[PDB]
Amino acid sequence: QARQLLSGIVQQQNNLLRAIEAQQHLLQLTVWGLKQIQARILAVERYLKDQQL
Amino acid sequence: QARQLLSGIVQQQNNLLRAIEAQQHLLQLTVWGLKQIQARILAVERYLKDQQL
Amino acid sequence: QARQLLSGIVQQQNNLLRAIEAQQHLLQLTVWGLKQIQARILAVERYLKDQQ
Ligand SMILES: [Cl-]
């Protein structure tokens, strides 16, 4: 009752912490990937600038 | 008092869930965005390889 | 135990709140960064279409 309510609130809080932890991990991986493409574009710009007539 | 404290905590829990659901949509947009630029850079890299002398 | 448990729940709500605020900022920075790379790839694509 109070105990079931409190039990439910605890479990939902644990669910929400688990959900933000998953988002944090996916966002960390996305930011890493964006760093990788930044590198790739930079290399393509360097190339093109070196090849420029 | 118990009822007011527990109502405030339950309402906040719903508020937090809502905020995390909004950040999920944004996060998936960043994942989609990274995917689209990945494809675009790969398409350039390949063009530049194909066109080289 | 209930007042201590309630105290813990409320502290964890405040800390969830701070984590959501920090992830808002990181998402915003990540969007900005994406938009910057999109523009750079767009400029490359237009340059290449012009030299074709
Ligand atoms: Cl919560």
R_g of chain A, CA atoms, integer Å: 23
Backbone angles phi, psi at A13, to 5 degrees: -70, -45
Number of domains present in the structure of chain B: 1
* Rounded distance from Cα A18 to ligand 1 centre (Å): 11
* Rounded distance from Cα A10 to ligand 1 centre (Å): 7
Is-contact C11 B14, C-beta < 8 A?
no
Resolution in A: 2.0
| Residue B15 CA to its chain's centroid (Å) | 19
| Residue C30 CA to its chain's centroid (Å) | 5
Chain B residues whose beta carbon lies within 8 Å of the beta carbon of residue A30: 27, 30-31, 34
Owning domain of residue A23? 1-53
- For residue A48 the two structure tokens come to 């093109």
- The CATH number that applies at residue A38 is 1.20.5.170
Chain B residue closest in CA terms to C21: B19
Report helix angle C2-50 to B2-51, nearest 10. 20
Nearby residues of B17 by Cβ (< 8 Å), 6 or more positions away:
A12, A16
Residue A53 touches chain B, beta carbons under 8 Å: no
Helices (H), chain A: 2-51
Q: Residue C31, Cβ neighbours under 10 Å: how many?
A: 14
Method of determination used here: X-ray
